[PDB]
Amino acid sequence: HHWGYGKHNGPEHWHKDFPIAKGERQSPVDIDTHTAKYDPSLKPLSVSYDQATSLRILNNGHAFNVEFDDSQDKAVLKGGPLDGTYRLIQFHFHWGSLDGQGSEHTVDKKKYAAELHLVHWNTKYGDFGKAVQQPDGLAVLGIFLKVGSAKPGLQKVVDVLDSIKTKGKSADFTNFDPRGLLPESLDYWTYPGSLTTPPLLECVTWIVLKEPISVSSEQVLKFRKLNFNGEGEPEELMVDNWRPAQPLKNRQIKASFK
Ligand SMILES: CCCCNC(=O)c1ccc(S(N)(=O)=O)cc1
Ligand SMILES: [Zn+2]
Numbered sequence: 001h002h003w004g005y006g007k008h009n010g011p012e013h014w015h016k017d018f019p020i021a022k023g024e025r026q027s028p029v030d031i032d033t034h035t036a037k038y039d040p041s042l043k044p045l046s047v048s049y050d051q052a053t054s055l056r057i058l059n060n061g062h063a064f065n066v067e068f069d070d071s072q073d074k075a076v077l078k079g080g081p082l083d084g085t086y087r088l089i090q091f092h093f094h095w096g097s098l099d100g101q102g103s104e105h106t107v108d109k110k111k112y113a114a115e116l117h118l119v120h121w122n123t124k125y126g127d128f129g130k131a132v133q134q135p136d137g138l139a140v141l142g143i144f145l146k147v148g149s150a151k152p153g154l155q156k157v158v159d160v161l162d163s164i165k166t167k168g169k170s171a172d173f174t175n176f177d178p179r180g181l182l183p184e185s186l187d188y189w190t191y192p193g194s195l196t197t198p199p200l201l202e203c204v205t206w207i208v209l210k211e212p213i214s215v216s217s218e219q220v221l222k223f224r225k226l227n228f229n230g231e232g233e234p235e236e237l238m239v240d241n242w243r244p245a246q247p248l249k250n251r252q253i254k255a256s257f258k
Helices: 011-016 152-164 217-223
Strands: 045-048 054-059 064-068 076-079 086-095 114-122 138-147 170-172 188-193 204-209 213-215
Touching (some): 054 152, 076 114, 086 138, 138 217, 152 217
Parallel strands (some): 138 213
Antiparallel strands (some): 045 076, 054 064, 054 170, 076 086, 086 114
16 A cells, blocks of 8 residues: 555556656666776775664564664764765665575676665755755665675674564664674775665665675575564565666766775
């Protein structure tokens, strides 16, 4: 009863209620590494999460979000292609029904099993709801997950998923340190794009890390046991909650590394 990922309300249908779906700066995209241009003027990213204050985890019927206190300049992203300071508000993942699909961005048409999105908003706009109406309002740090060794820093998220199995369940989720979800390198590609879910607003500077993190098959299985439906309703497993690659059109993807 609204948009989703099924055959009847999935990404190919979104344009009917969100005509920006066919706009000029939609996300995600395929990152063609033979075409992305190294840009030695790009600055190093500064990811400052030491004071991050997580609050809550919520199943919103499309994914689960871990939300942070963003009332002050605690956990912020600066530098790289960005001007000024972007505050962390929430992170979530997109993932597949099988290990060979699930990421939203692709790298040379390669799909990863999942992708983490750490969502931040530009403090010059005062609040998140103002920021999404601006073309430089958000910065989303995207990180690929490949199936491999377990990620210790993810285990606290995987352990709480039982408690938010269905749409509209939430649980207290404090003292969670998002630093534990970062790879070793912060090398990245960057391009101007959009939210990858309705309302698909064209307000995001994408920063996509080159190095994936590794998660175990038991960890990603736990994501796949979540439900899109609410309690009581017919069970629909929360899998394949990814939007496919959208045309790059007149954009250039920049690499921070050569
Ligand atoms: C008004 C916005 C309400 C829907 N909300 C979002 O806040 C949103 C944030 C990040 C993404 S994503 N997947 O591109 O990181 C998509 C959507
Ligand atoms: Zn996302």
